[PDB]
């Protein structure tokens, strides 16, 4: 579950 911009 993605909760963040990584780049």
């Amino acid at each position, epitope marked *: *579950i*993605i*909760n*963040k*911009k*990584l780049d």
Partner: antibody
């Protein structure tokens, strides 16, 4: 599950360098993102930055001139260096996995002569 | 950076009653990819923060459905339908659509039992 544990000196003299290490068990640091974040006394959370699966780093521009995050994939460890500390750097320092899913228990660093 | 502000900072709640925490950000968190990276941590006493809610309203794993989240663009709400003892702690909203990631002051939820 992934386990993290930070280690480092609890005491740092003003204008010296703080060094911390995070040891990761259960998965390789060649694969994720590895974050540092801190909690000053009573003053919410402050993001420090990360190192990536590839070694690329991102630093909070509030700190980027004095901060280094590095890694030793042989020991499955990544580390934090914050130079020229002041009492403003007194905090609990946490390491955490990508998306902050897994956390270490934190280590208190006190800046004092 | 993007500023996160929570209200109240202190929230006494009778056991079994509902509880609400509001979070507001100084910028929209709706990214052009359609996602809104407003999230909530729960920091139980003596522990590190843990993921509570991701993307405004998706409950993270192991989180009871008494928790709810809401809002759009700049105004956000954490809700607990019936407060139970395990809810003791500090709650932080944070933001992951702009670098650096930024965190609220935290709201301390104290329980009336």
């Amino acid at each position: 599950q992934v386990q993290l544990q930070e280690s480092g000196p609890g005491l740092v003299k003003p204008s010296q360098t703080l060094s911390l290490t995070c040891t990761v068990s259960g998965d390789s640091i060649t694969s994720g993102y590895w974050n540092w974040i801190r909690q000053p006394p009573g003053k919410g959370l402050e993001y420090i930055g990360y190192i990536r699966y590839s070694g690329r780093t991102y630093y909070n521009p509030s700190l980027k001139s004095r901060v280094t995050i590095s890694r030793d994939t042989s020991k499955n460890q990544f580390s934090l260096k914050l130079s020229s500390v002041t009492a403003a750097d007194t905090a609990v320092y946490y390491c955490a996995s990508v998306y902050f899913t897994y956390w270490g228990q934190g280590t208190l660093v006190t800046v004092s002569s | 950076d993007v500023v996160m502000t929570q209200t109240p900072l202190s929230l006494p709640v009778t056991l079994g009653q509902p509880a609400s925490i509001s979070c507001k950000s100084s910028q929209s968190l709706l990214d052009s990819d359609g996602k809104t990276y407003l999230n909530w941590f729960q920091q139980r006493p003596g522990q590190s923060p843990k993921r509570l809610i991701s993307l405004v309203s998706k409950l993270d794993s192991g989180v009871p459905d008494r928790f709810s989240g809401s809002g759009s663009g700049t105004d956000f709400t954490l809700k607990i339908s019936r407060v139970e003892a395990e809810d003791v702690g500090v709650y932080y909203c944070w933001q992951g659509s702009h670098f650096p990631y930024t965190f609220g002051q935290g709201t301390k939820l104290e329980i009336k039992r």
